[PDB]
């Protein structure tokens, strides 16, 4: 044999590569046969229970749902409520609680003493 280096790779066309990868996906499905059956049963039971149709109404008329949500929420009361909830979270974060654990323990002891009085 003489010296030959170049490699003539086999001509796997798009059809053959697609078939090979689809066969790989089918084999992966085969390995998880029970899982696929369980997920199909998942969808079936959700659709029977109306959960899937409920989400279908949610995402088909989603513009109407968002419109209803914003038109009900746009009242100043709801915006103030959400703003004050965020502010309460921020302030509770600002409050230092490392020193507050002994205070909580003392409050526990005090409540125990108070309820101890019959």
């Amino acid at each position: 044999a003489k010296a030959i280096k170049r490699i003539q790779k086999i001509e796997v066309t798009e059809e053959d590569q697609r078939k090979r990868d689809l066969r790989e996906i089918e084999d992966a499905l085969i390995d998880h046969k029970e899982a696929i059956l369980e997920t199909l049963h998942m969808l079936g039971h959700m659709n029977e229970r109306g959960v899937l149709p409920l989400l279908r109404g949610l995402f088909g008329q989603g513009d109407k749902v968002l419109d209803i949500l914003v038109k009900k929420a746009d009242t100043e009361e709801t915006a103030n409520t959400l703003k004050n909830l965020l502010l309460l979270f921020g302030t509770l974060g600002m409050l230092d609680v490392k020193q507050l654990e002994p205070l909580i323990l003392k409050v526990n002891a005090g409540v125990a003493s108070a309820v101890e009085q019959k």
């Binding site: 044999a1 003489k2 490699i7």
Partner: protein, 975 residues
């Protein structure tokens, strides 16, 4: 003995010296961060504080004196351990959830979880030093370095590369390479000890970096703010520690950790290979590994990129016209089967010769020899052992009768004296050299290195003497004569287990000390003092690699070495004996399973009626009475037309055999050629059909290393593409040849060979599970023989025989071939580098072959560095770059085999081989010195490990740390 009381309960003491070993055996939850079983007490983390005799002291180094009181749940010892770990965490950021080393084995994480700590008294402080990513394999993160010193102790004491020290004198102590040289520019062998022994992710492989887990691939610019967020958010370490344990479980699914044995050299180091799909993330050694434990080299721990290399042959290749067409498996199998049947039924099976790879598992070589004998009917089989271990094995037969090493590498360490001759153990069998250097630096063992070159071990040897090319026989037999003549020889051993002492002495009559002084060009004083040392040494371990066995008289001097130990009386003694350095990972295994043509599996000669009858009964096909021809003589037979077809697997013999012009002519002369290599090797270029091999990571088998250990592998990867493990390919080929083999998994092959092989009688796959390994010979009960010749020799009388041998004249060409070039191998690169070159890091460390030339010869011939020079021999003509170093002396120069092009040394060597085994004399080469280019790029870059200057120190030198004023001992800190 040495009664003790621990935890208020009486307990007994064992051979263990320190309290920490007893506590570990007692399962006492004592924090041990800086302690590693292989490393020994490093004493740098102070988290092992226990109350010995009431006083707080480090249990890692507290001697287990009799009658001491041990307590570990006391508030005092708990506070001391907490303070020590707080000091540790002051140097460790501890971002376990997004840290690659949190695969659940990280000692800081485990120990922190064990102590149930929640706060660090000293907050983490980043060291001013940046991460050192200069190395292409592993990085060092001084920010995450806890200064435990395990990496330094590994690089200084258990691997003895000595590239790592710790600058305790610095304001912020850190690990420094050489004199704080960046890692790449330093003398770091890249062995991987520091990465393996690091507790934290301080010294961790770049393969893991950003690839281990799921949340650790996040970019640093967006990972560091998350780490700071979690630092400022969580109040107790327990909850985020549990989250990090969940992230460890996360990693467990994607990270596959399978045990394997390194393919490169014959030490056969076993380690887990932590992978994520197809890429190799880490090579993690385990303490339970028999051959190495934690020891590893650059190849086995960072050289596995060849498995995922795109050059890998995924499909069978068929020589179509003037090209290699990527053909289907079935059509290639039919073609090879039909051609083999044609040349078998036309000119007979005797004209068929097949070669197994010494790099393949035992099942592979057994399948080669079965296909040759139980299928084809020929006996023409060989491996690299014809070039590597044929004369050593022949000498072992001639004197001791058993091939392979006398014992394990642990017995090598236990030796008082190691007699290494012609071995570049530092650069060829790295882990064994680490063991020897560890025993020399720590245990005080003195070694005698005898080779022409001055490698790392030669400059670190007790007595390094450089004899003439192939002159090992002369000075060796003179030393044996002096030992046996002055009474220092073990006469009791000679009368007990040796035969023909007086005949050998008669053979030693012409040999005198002055004779050896004249022949070897070595002064008398060195010879007499090394002979005195050998006589005085209680245990002697003699290692002889290709520097001595690859010669015209290589077999003769191998017998000479073996009978030298025989005269000294080291066989059978624990810790001493002959350990021929088996080169390939499974060259010992291939030779065990009938690779050599003159012997069958079980190390039994073919010309024996009983073994032939047994193999006929098991196989059903008659055995060829005619012994097969040797591998080297195959080319000459081809040039005479005797041989026509080759089936060489995993052996690039068209480039590694002597006079590769001759093998090229034979290759162009023969009709049919089938090769089986993972890569398109040089031999793979000349082949009528190329079969795509599979690397040992993607196949399961048994590797027999130098210590005659059969360690079972595991299938780390599914084979790349649709290529198959070589045993599967051989099964398919034989079935297409009407063999009828049915082996679903190589366990059936292993057990069949075990039944056939008397030496392998006991090795089975259920006895080789995990890291368990058996050393052949093994009996049917399953009890192996860690030490050879322990009670009796294999010979019928039970006593070995001294073989009378003399100095066989080396086939130096003479005349104009003045400069005697020497051929060998580099530490980082493996032969021509069909595997290491595919790894980018090793290529960066060593890009191209170089000719190491002596400074003395650089003056008379006027040669410089980075110069392209020409070497011409009656068999070849190479153009190799030049390197200036003092490793070689005088005319003799070193030409490593780390190139596969026109610069490969194998052009220069000739078709002159040993008389006993026809092993080519690669070390016997001479050429010219032609100067082509005066000024050019130096082949050895500054980032090569040979350019650095290691700092030799014993241990982490903790005493420097203790002298620091800022350092405070937790035991007296709690007080």
């Amino acid at each position: 003995k040495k009664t003790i009381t621990i935890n208020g309960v009486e307990m007994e003491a064992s051979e263990e010296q320190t309290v920490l070993q007893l506590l570990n055996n007692s399962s006492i939850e004592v924090p041990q961060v800086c302690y590693h079983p292989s490393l020994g007490p490093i004493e740098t983390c102070d988290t092992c504080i226990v109350s010995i005799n009431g006083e707080l002291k480090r249990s890692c180094s507290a001697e287990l004196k009799d009658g001491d009181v041990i307590d570990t749940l006391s508030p005092d010892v708990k506070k001391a351990q907490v303070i020590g770990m707080d000091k540790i965490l002051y140097n460790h950021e501890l971002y376990c959830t997004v840290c690659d080393y949190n695969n659940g084995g990280c000692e800081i994480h485990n120990t922190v979880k064990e102590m149930k700590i929640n706060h660090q008294s000293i907050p983490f402080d980043h060291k001013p030093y940046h991460k050192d990513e200069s190395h292409p394999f592993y990085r060092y993160d001084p920010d995450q370095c806890i200064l435990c010193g395990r990496c330094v102790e590994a690089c200084q004491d258990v691997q003895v590369t000595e590239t790592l020290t710790i600058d305790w004198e610095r304001k912020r102590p850190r690990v420094i390479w050489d004199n704080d040289v960046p890692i790449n520019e330093s003398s770091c062998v890249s062995c991987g000890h520091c990465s393996t022994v690091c507790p934290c992710n301080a010294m961790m492989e770049k393969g893991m970096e950003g690839e281990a887990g799921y949340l650790t691939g996040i970019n640093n610019e967006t990972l560091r703010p998350m780490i700071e967020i979690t630092k400022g958010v969580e109040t107790g370490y327990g909850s985020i520690l549990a989250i990090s344990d969940m992230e460890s479980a996360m990693r467990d699914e994607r990270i596959k950790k399978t045990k394997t044995v390194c393919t490169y050299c014959g030490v056969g180091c076993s380690f887990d290979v932590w992978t994520k799909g197809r890429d190799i993330l880490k090579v993690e050694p385990q303490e339970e590994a028999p051959a190495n434990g934690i020891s590893t080299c650059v190849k086995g721990k960072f050289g596995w990129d060849f498995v995922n290399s795109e050059e890998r042959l995924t499909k069978p290749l068929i020589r179509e016209g003037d090209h290699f067409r990527e053909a289907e498996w079935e059509e290639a199998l039919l073609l090879i089967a039909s051609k083999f049947t044609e040349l078998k039924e036309a000119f007979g099976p005797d004209s068929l010769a097949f070669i197994t790879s010494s790099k393949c598992t035992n099942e592979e070589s057994y399948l080669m020899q079965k296909l040759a004998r139980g299928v084809i009917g020929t006996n023409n089989v060989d491996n690299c052992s014809r070039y590597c271990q044929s004369p050593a094995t022949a000498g072992l037969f001639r004197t001791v009768g058993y091939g392979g090493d006398s014992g394990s590498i642990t017995d090598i360490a236990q030796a008082d004296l190691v007699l290494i001759i012609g071995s570049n153990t530092s650069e060829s069998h790295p882990v064994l050299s680490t063991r020897i250097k560890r025993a020399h630096k720590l245990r005080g063992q003195k070694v005698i290195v005898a080779d022409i070159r001055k490698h790392e071990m030669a400059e670190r040897s007790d007595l390094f003497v450089q004899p003439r090319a192939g002159s090992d026989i002369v000075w060796l037999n003179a030393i044996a004569k002096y030992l046996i003549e002055n009474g220092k020889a073990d006469e009791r051993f000679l009368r007990e287990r040796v035969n023909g002492r007086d005949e050998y002495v008669k053979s030693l009559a012409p040999y005198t000390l002055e004779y050896a002084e004249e022949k070897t060009g070595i002064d008398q004083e060195t010879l007499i003092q090394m002979a005195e040392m050998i006589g005085q040494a209680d245990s002697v371990c003699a290692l002889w690699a290709m520097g001595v066995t690859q010669h015209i008289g290589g077999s003769d001097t191998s017998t000479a070495i073996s009978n030298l130990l025989l005269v000294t009386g080291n066989y059978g003694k624990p810790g001493a004996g002959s350990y021929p350095l088996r080169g390939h990972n499974n060259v010992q295994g291939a030779s065990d399973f009938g690779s050599m043509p003159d012997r069958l599996p079980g190390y039994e000669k073919v010309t024996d009626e009983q073994v032939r009858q047994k193999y006929e009964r098991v196989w059903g096909v008659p055995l060829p009475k005619e012994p097969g021809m040797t591998n080297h003589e195959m080319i000459e037979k081809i040039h005479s037309g005797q041989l026509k077809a080759m089936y060489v697997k995993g052996e690039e013999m068209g480039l590694v055999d002597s006079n590769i012009n001759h093998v090229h002519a034979a290759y162009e002369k023969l009709d049919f050629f089938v090769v089986q290599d993972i890569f398109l090797s040089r031999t793979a270029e000349f082949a009528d059909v190329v079969l795509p091999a599979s690397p040992s990571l993607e196949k399961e088998g048994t590797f027999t290393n130098t210590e005659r250990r059969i360690q079972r592998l595991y299938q780390v990867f599914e084979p790349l593409g649709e290529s198959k493990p070589d045993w599967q390919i051989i099964m398919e080929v034989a079935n297409k040849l009407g063999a009828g083999w049915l082996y679903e998994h190589p366990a059936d092959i292993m057990e069949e060979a075990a039944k056939l092989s008397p030496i392998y009688a006991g090795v089975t796959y259920e006895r080789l599970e995990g890291y368990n390994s058996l050393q052949w010979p093994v009996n049917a009960d399953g009890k192996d023989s860690p030490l050879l010749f322990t009670e009796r020799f294999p010979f019928p009388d039970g006593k070995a025989i001294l073989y009378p041998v003399q100095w066989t004249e080396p086939k130096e060409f003479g005349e104009e071939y003045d400069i005697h070039v020497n051929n060998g191998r580099l530490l980082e690169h493996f032969h021509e580098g069909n595997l290491t070159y595919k790894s980018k890091g090793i290529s960066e460390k060593t890009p191209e072959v170089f000719l190491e030339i002596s400074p003395e010869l650089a003056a008379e011939r006027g040669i410089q560095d980075g110069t392209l020079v020409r070497l011409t021999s009656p068999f070849g003509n190479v153009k190799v770059k030049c390197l200036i170093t003092d490793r070689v002396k005088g005319k003799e120069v070193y030409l490593p085999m780390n190139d596969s092009g026109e610069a490969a040394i194998n052009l220069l060597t000739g078709s002159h081989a040993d008389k006993d085994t026809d092993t080519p004399a690669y070390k016997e080469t001479s050429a010219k010195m032609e100067i082509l280019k005066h000024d050019g790029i130096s082949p050895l870059p500054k980032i090569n490990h040979r350019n650095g200057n290691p700092q030799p120190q014993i241990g982490v030198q903790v005493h420097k740390k203790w002298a620091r004023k800022d350092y405070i001992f937790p035991g007296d800190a709690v007080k």
